[PDB]
Amino acid sequence: GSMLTGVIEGFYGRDWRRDERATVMDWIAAAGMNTYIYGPKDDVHVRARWRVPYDAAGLARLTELRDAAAARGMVFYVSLAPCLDVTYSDPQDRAALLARVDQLARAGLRNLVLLFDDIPSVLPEADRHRFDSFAEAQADLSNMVLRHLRGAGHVVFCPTEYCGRMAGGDPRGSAYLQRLGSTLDPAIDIFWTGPEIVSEEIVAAHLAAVGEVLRRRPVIWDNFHANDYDIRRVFAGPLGGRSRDILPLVAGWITNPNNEAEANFPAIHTTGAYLADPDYAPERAIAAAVAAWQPRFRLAFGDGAVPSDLVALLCDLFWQPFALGPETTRILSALRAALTVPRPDPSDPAWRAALEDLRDLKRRINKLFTLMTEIENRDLFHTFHNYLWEAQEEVGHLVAYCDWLDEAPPPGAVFPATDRIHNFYRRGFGVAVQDILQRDRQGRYHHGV
Amino acid sequence: MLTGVIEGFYGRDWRRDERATVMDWIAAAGMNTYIYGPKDDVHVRARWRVPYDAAGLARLTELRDAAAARGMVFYVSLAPCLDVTYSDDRAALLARVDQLARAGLRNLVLLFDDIAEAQADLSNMVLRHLRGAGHVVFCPTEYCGRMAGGDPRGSAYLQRLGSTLDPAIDIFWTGPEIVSEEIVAAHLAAVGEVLRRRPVIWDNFHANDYDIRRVFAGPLGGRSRDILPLVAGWITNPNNEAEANFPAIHTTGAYLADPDYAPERAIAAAVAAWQPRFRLAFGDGAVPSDLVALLCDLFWQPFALGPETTRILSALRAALTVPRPDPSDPAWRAALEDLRDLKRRINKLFTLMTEIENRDLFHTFHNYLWEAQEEVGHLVAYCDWLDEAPPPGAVFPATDRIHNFYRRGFGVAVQDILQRDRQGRYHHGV
Numbered sequence A: 001g002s003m004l005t006g007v008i009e010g011f012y013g014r015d016w017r018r019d020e021r022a023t024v025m026d027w028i029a030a031a032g033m034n035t036y037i038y039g040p041k042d043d044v045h046v047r048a049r050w051r052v053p054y055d056a057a058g059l060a061r062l063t064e065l066r067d068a069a070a071a072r073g074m075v076f077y078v079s080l081a082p083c084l085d086v087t088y089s090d091p092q093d094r095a096a097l098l099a100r101v102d103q104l105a106r107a108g109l110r111n112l113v114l115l116f117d118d119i120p121s122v123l124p125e126a127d128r129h130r131f132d133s134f135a136e137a138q139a140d141l142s143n144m145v146l147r148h149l150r151g152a153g154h155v156v157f158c159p160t161e162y163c164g165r166m167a168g169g170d171p172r173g174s175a176y177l178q179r180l181g182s183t184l185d186p187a188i189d190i191f192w193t194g195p196e197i198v199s200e201e202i203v204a205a206h207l208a209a210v211g212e213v214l215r216r217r218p219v220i221w222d223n224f225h226a227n228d229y230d231i232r233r234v235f236a237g238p239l240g241g242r243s244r245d246i247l248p249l250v251a252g253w254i255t256n257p258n259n260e261a262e263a264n265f266p267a268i269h270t271t272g273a274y275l276a277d278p279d280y281a282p283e284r285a286i287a288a289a290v291a292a293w294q295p296r297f298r299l300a301f302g303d304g305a306v307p308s309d310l311v312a313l314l315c316d317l318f319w320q321p322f323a324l325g326p327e328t329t330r331i332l333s334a335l336r337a338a339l340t341v342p343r344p345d346p347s348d349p350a351w352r353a354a355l356e357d358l359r360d361l362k363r364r365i366n367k368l369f370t371l372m373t374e375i376e377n378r379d380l381f382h383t384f385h386n387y388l389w390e391a392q393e394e395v396g397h398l399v400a401y402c403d404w405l406d407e408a409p410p411p412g413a414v415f416p417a418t419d420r421i422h423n424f425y426r427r428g429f430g431v432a433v434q435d436i437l438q439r440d441r442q443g444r445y446h447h448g449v
Numbered sequence B: 001m002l003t004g005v006i007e008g009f010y011g012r013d014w015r016r017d018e019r020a021t022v023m024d025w026i027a028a029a030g031m032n033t034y035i036y037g038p039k040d041d042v043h044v045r046a047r048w049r050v051p052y053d054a055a056g057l058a059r060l061t062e063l064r065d066a067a068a069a070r071g072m073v074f075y076v077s078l079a080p081c082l083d084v085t086y087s088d089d090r091a092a093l094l095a096r097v098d099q100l101a102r103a104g105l106r107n108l109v110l111l112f113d114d115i116a117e118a119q120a121d122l123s124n125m126v127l128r129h130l131r132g133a134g135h136v137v138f139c140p141t142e143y144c145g146r147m148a149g150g151d152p153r154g155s156a157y158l159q160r161l162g163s164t165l166d167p168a169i170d171i172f173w174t175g176p177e178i179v180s181e182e183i184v185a186a187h188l189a190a191v192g193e194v195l196r197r198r199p200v201i202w203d204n205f206h207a208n209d210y211d212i213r214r215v216f217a218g219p220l221g222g223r224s225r226d227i228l229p230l231v232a233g234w235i236t237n238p239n240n241e242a243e244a245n246f247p248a249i250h251t252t253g254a255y256l257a258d259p260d261y262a263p264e265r266a267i268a269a270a271v272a273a274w275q276p277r278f279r280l281a282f283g284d285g286a287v288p289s290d291l292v293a294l295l296c297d298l299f300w301q302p303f304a305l306g307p308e309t310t311r312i313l314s315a316l317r318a319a320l321t322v323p324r325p326d327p328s329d330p331a332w333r334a335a336l337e338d339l340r341d342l343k344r345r346i347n348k349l350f351t352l353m354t355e356i357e358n359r360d361l362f363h364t365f366h367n368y369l370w371e372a373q374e375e376v377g378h379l380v381a382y383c384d385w386l387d388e389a390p391p392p393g394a395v396f397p398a399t400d401r402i403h404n405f406y407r408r409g410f411g412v413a414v415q416d417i418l419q420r421d422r423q424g425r426y427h428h429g430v
C-alpha cells in the first residue's frame, strides 16, 4: 500500500526558487505522490561546509517547505553529505554531524537523507585502526545519526556505489555492498539508481539481486528525467523502461528530474501515472499529460493557446534519455533508409514521402516555436526557447540538404553549404573532440580506422 | 566615436545589477556606449505599437542615469518591422518616439532586420521628430556581406538605402557574415561606398546565442587595427551570460585603444585583470591565473580553439593516424601525457570554481566546464585503452568506460545523417 513517492531536488546546477518549489509540490500532489526531498548541490550546508549549522533564515525556509508539503498531504526530507573530508572515527567530526542533526531535529525536521556518494581514494589513516572498510565507517556514522533521533522520523542512506556499474555488474559481487547491507541499521533505507546512474531499464531480476546484497528493498532514485549531464538536452517525454512488476521489489520511488522546474510537468504527471495506474503505457500517459499541460501554454495578447498537437510535438522532440519520440524517430529513420544511396530518386515514393514528412516536421517546429514566443508564462517559454531553436536549426539544415538532393544533382557535384548553412554551425571544443572520438552506427568507438 | 556593447541577443535579458556590472566593464575598458535592445522586451519588437508604462520608462531613465554616472551614453531600440505598413502605424511609431523623447531618451536604434525606400522614409520621420537633438542608428535588413550578395556595392537594397536614408543617421554592419571570422579593410571600404558613410560596426564575434554548447571567453580576433579609420563606431553584441563577457569587453577595449593589440597578449592582460573576481569563499585564496587562462583557452573563439587546446588535440590526431599507436613512440607518449595533464587541469579548475565567492560567475561556467571535462575524460579513456596495445581485431569496451547517456538526442541524430568531412564538405556517409 503505502510507500515514499515523489521528487528529489538533487541535480547539479542552480537550485529552484521558492515559487518553483511550490509549483513542483502542486504537481507532485496532483500526481498522487507524497514526498519532496530537499538536496540541491547548490546548498553549501548540505556538502561543501557540512560542519556548519544553518542560520535562522536558512532553517526558517526549511520549516516553511515542510509546512507547504504538509498542507498538500506530503512529507519533506533534508539532505546532508558528511563525506568530503570526514574522518569517520573523529570525536569533533562526529559531534559536528550530531549538532547538524540536533538543529534539524529540534526544528521538527527528522526526515533525513545521508549522502556518501563522493569519498577520497583510500580510507583515512586515523580511521584504519577503528574501521576495516569505507562501508563499516559510513554505516557506523549513519547508525549514530539514527540513534540520536530516538526512534522518531526516518533516515535514507545514499551509498558510494549506488548503481550496478559502480558495484561491478552483479551487486552481490560488491565487497562494499556486502559489508554495507550487513552493517547499516535495518531501520535505514538505501537509495539505488538501477544498473547505471541513468538507467535505460530497471528490471525485476536486477532489483531482486540488489535486495539480496542490501538486505532490504531499495528506495529507487531514478535519474531517467535528469538533464544535468548534457547542456543540449531536456526530457519532456513519459517515464519508460520500468515495468510495474518491479514495484513489489522497492520500498520507495523518488525521481531526480530536469534542472528547469517548468520542464517537469510531463515527468511528474507520467511518473505519478506509472506509480498509480496498473495499465500504464508511456504513449497513452504522455497524451494525458499533454492534455493536462496545454492550458499552461495560454497566449498573452488574445484568446488562444498553443494547440495540443504542437505541445505533443514538444514532448516528441524532447522525449527520453535513450529514445527520440515516436514521430521524430520514424521521420529520421525513413530518411536514413532513403539515404542508403548517394543520389535518391526524386520519382521514388519512399524518398518523396520521407522528404515531405521532413518538410512538414520543419513547418510544425516553426509553428510551435513562433507560438511559444507568444505564451503568457515566460518561465515556460525560456525553459524551451534554446532547445527549440536548436531543433529548428538542425531540421532546417537537413531540409536544405534533402531539398538539394531532390533536384537530382550529378554524382560529382558537392552540396553548396556556404550559401545554405551558417558559417557558425557545428563548431567548437566538443565538436573537435567528437571529430577524434568517432562513433559508428552500431555504437562502436573508433578514430576513422 | 560610439564604442561599447549592445544587449541584443536572443534569450533572457540581463538583470539591473548585471547591466551595472557590464557598464562598469565598458567604462574601465575605455568605451562610452550601452545600447539597450534585448529580444526579450515586448515593446522593442513584438508589440512595438504599445508605449511603455511608468515603471518600464522609469527603468530606462535609471539606466540612462547609470550610464551617465560612468561618463557613458545610453541608447534605446525599436523594431517597427514585424507587420508594419510603412505608408499607413506612422503615428504609433511617432508616439513611441515622443514618449522616449519627453522622458529624455533621444538616442535611438531603429531595427529593420526581419520583414529600402519605405524603411528610409519611416526612419527620416523619426529623425525629424527629434528636432536636431540626440542620434539615430539604423539596423538594415541586409546587415552583412552574405545578405547583400558578396560585394555590398552589388546590393539594390544598400544602393537605395545609402542614397535615401538621411545623412545624420548612422548604419550598422556586421561584416561579411552575421558572425564574421574576419573583417578586412577592402570590405569596409566597399561598404562605406554603397552606404555613402562609414558604418558603425555591430560585431557578433563574442555572441553565443546561436549555439547552446558554446561561450566565448577568448580575445577579439580577426580584425586588424587598420580597419578602424573606415568605421564610425564599434559596438559588440556579446555572450548571453553577463559574467562571461569580462574578457570580451577587456579585449575589445584593448583593440580599440592599443596600436600594438595582439590577441594572445591581450588575453593574458584580461586574465590578470579578471583573476581577483575568482576569489574563494571563506579564506584568502583565488583560482590561480594559469587556470583562469585555461578557462579562456577552452572557451576561446567562434572559429578557433585556444592555442593550448588546439596543439593538444592536433598532436593526438597525428599520433592517431594508425589503427594501433605504438606505446613506445615518443610522439604518442607525449600526446597522451599532455591529454592526461589537460584532464587533470580542467578537474582542478572545475573543483576550484565550485569554491569561488561570486556564484553568478560560477553558474556562468559550471555547465560549459562539465561538458569539456566529460569530453576530455572520454578521450583519455579511449586513448588509455589504445595505450595497453590491444589486438587489431579488438573493439573498445565502451559500455564499461563511457557513460550510457553520452552523446545522444535529437541534434546528434540529425548530425548522424547530415555528416561533414574534414575538408568541410557535407554528405550522408556515401
Ligand SMILES: CC(=O)Nc1ncc(CN2CC[C@]3(CCN(c4cc(C)n5ccnc5n4)C3)C2)s1
Residues within 6 Å of the ligand: A010, A011, A012, A013, A117, A158, A162, A191, A193, A197, A198, A221, A223, A226, A228, A229, A256, B366, B367, B370
Ligand atoms: C545518487 C545519485 O545518483 N546522485 C545524483 N546526483 C546528480 C544526479 C544527476 N546526474 C546524472 C549523471 C551525473 C553523474 C555526474 N554528473 C555531473 C557532475 C557534475 C559535477 N556536474 C556539473 C554539471 N553537470 C554535472 N553532472 C552527471 C549526475 S544523480
Ligand SMILES: CC(=O)Nc1ncc(CN2CC[C@]3(CCN(c4cc(C)n5ccnc5n4)C3)C2)s1
Residues within 6 Å of the ligand: A385, A386, A389, B008, B009, B010, B011, B113, B139, B143, B172, B174, B178, B179, B202, B204, B207, B209, B210, B237
Ligand atoms: C543586426 C544583427 O547583427 N542582429 C543580431 N541580433 C542578434 C544577434 C546574435 N546572433 C548571432 C547569430 C544569430 C543569427 C540568428 N540567431 C538566433 C535567432 C533566434 C530566433 N534564436 C533563438 C534562440 N537562439 C537564436 N539564435 C543566431 C543571431 S546578431
Ligand SMILES: [Ca+2]
Residues within 6 Å of the ligand: A230, A231, A430, B371, B374
Ligand atoms: Ca557534452
